[PDB]
Symmetry: none
Subunit: 347 residues, 2 copies
């Protein structure tokens, strides 16, 4: 396989992508450029919103989905004009997750000219950064059944075989009005003090070797208006991160048995992910010296019910950061590693 | 003394004052009128801002001085005086024009008699908002005050104790970071034990007149987005002392228990007290008056010397729609004030 030519082409397509603003929900022009780029490779695409896909020829055999996102986080030097400096390509969305988008497509295109035991689907999803309803969630029900998926996010090409989920809970304590200088009222602030300590100290029974215990964090609180008015109402927000041993639904039910104050989940759908260690892909990865781990960062894996693994070029620490960059050498390395894992893989 | 004549003159001045709008900080015209009135009575006045005072004749520093005080400002309407059912309506009639007019008549009469003490009459402004241009601006400039009488609606019963006010802002400081990672320092978790402490602690000294120091945590705020560990959390504490502590005494104890940066908006609105064995108090009790403790702030809070709060009307009427004062209340006040002060061996 011609790695240097795939790398040189992946890098030019990424410069184009960095130059096109593609913040969550305002990704139309980037999606245009992507679709029109693939079309020029003799491939017939599919589209829904700013989500673009491409099925392999002669399908339906197990199917492997190759996926990453084209939306970016808002900025914050340089704007989004690409710049190269002694091996580094600077740009918003270069590390998270552009580098993965350009590598997987080059790999998809090369593998479409080889004889494999599986069908292959490429997907450039949108609204990943805000967990948006018109992202990946809107496309899965139309595509053919997915047997296995690779999600491209920066993991220094290490296989993330477990990923924490996300659930946000709004809790409200209702007290009673009064004069603070008198013997009147029910203080809504006092009512939530034990609740907050419980959120910080409670440990769910099942603990994961890869993600440790379920994590819960009280990160926003509000109550009261002026100093001589009894606070009637108090609201707080809990950010909850399941391990792969629990659903968001299992956690909410447990929590409602210990907390008396009204509590509501904003959603239950962004669950944790898991893939069995004997899975053929995990097994070939390990035989190639890769070290499987568990990721604390949410991705498009959370909207996938089928088995998946998170593995892509770049590093976590550069994401959502000033002067974000990807190394030309990391893209070269990613393409070659992706090719070795997939070529001759039997599910 | 001619009590009926004094009463008609006091009631006549009260009408003229009600008609002049004097919302806190905007009492210039009401103070102009009042200054002129006092000058026309043949008394030389003193003035600073909208505070008007005058001193008894032959004032000497070898005798003790009693200060008579009330305020000319009023709260915003909830001003044309009407009379109906032996009762005078208008903004500032109960709180506190009725004391203003009564104390002035009492002052002008005692100034023509021989007493063991000197007198100062003071009409202060900005009381309702405890403003800096009010009584706080005047006191350091006057001669020494042995004790003062503050005229507020107490039904001519003496308030010998008054609560103070202190507001505290406490801030916990942490460190930001990602909530799903092993990062940051949560500023909200830092304040949990503190808030329980403010609600459960009881100061050692309780008053029979005001009960114990009261503290309440009434406002809390922290955080912005769910995935970011909060690095700041601020809350507010409303604290009302009894007469057995200054606000600084309360702050020093609080700081021994709370590590988080805590800052008072001010210490200056302290509790007040006058000893039960003070001669004025003993005279009142002898006349069948019943001393009590008031939970309501007044200009007493800015006086470091001993004081008693006693005036015509009832506090239930203050700050209310259709404010009034019974004419019989001005008449009674004048006579009670004169039985108390006339011949008092200070
Ligand atoms: Cl997501
Ligand atoms: Cl109040
Ligand atoms: Cl952060
Ligand atoms: Cl998040
Ligand atoms: Cl201060
Ligand atoms: Cl005393």
């Amino acid at each position: 396989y011609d790695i240097p030519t795939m790398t040189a082409e992946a890098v030019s397509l990424l410069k184009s992508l960095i130059s096109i603003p593609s913040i969550s929900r305002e990704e139309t022009q980037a999606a245009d450029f992507l679709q029109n780029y693939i079309e020029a490779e003799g491939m017939q695409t599919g589209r829904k919103g700013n989500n673009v896909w491409c099925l392999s020829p002669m399908f339906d055999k197990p199917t492997i989905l190759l996926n990453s996102h084209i939306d970016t986080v808002k900025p914050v030097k340089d704007p989004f004009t690409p710049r190269e400096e002694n091996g580094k390509l600077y740009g918003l969305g270069s590390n998270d997750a552009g580098a993965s988008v350009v590598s997987l497509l080059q790999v998809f295109l090369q593998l479409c000219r080889t004889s494999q035991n599986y069908n292959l689907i490429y997907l450039a999803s949108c609204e990943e950064e805000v967990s948006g309803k018109e992202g990946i969630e809107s496309v899965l029900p139309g595509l053919p059944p997915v047997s296995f998926a690779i999600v491209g996010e920066p993991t220094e090409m290490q296989p993330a075989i477990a990923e924490k989920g996300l659930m946000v809970l709004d809790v409200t304590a209702t007290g009673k009005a009064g004069h603070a200088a008198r013997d009147e009222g029910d203080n809504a602030i006092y009512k939530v003090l034990n609740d907050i300590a419980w959120f910080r100290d409670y440990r769910f029974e099942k603990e994961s070797p890869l993600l440790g215990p379920v994590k819960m964090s009280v990160t926003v609180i509000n109550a009261g208006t002026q100093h001589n008015v009894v606070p009637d109402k108090c609201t707080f927000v809990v950010d909850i991160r399941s391990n792969e041993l629990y659903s968001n639904e299992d956690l909410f039910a447990e929590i409602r048995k210990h907390i008396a104050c009204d509590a509501k989940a904003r959603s239950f759908r962004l669950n944790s992910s898991r893939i069995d260690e004997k899975h053929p892909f995990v097994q070939k990865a390990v035989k190639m010296g890769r070290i499987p781990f568990g990721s604390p960062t949410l991705s498009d894996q959370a909207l996938m019910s089928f088995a998946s693994v998170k593995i892509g070029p770049g590093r976590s620490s550069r994401s959502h950061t000033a002067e974000e960059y990807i190394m030309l050498k990391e893209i070269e390395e990613a393409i070659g590693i992706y090719l070795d894992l997939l070529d001759g893989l039997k599910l």
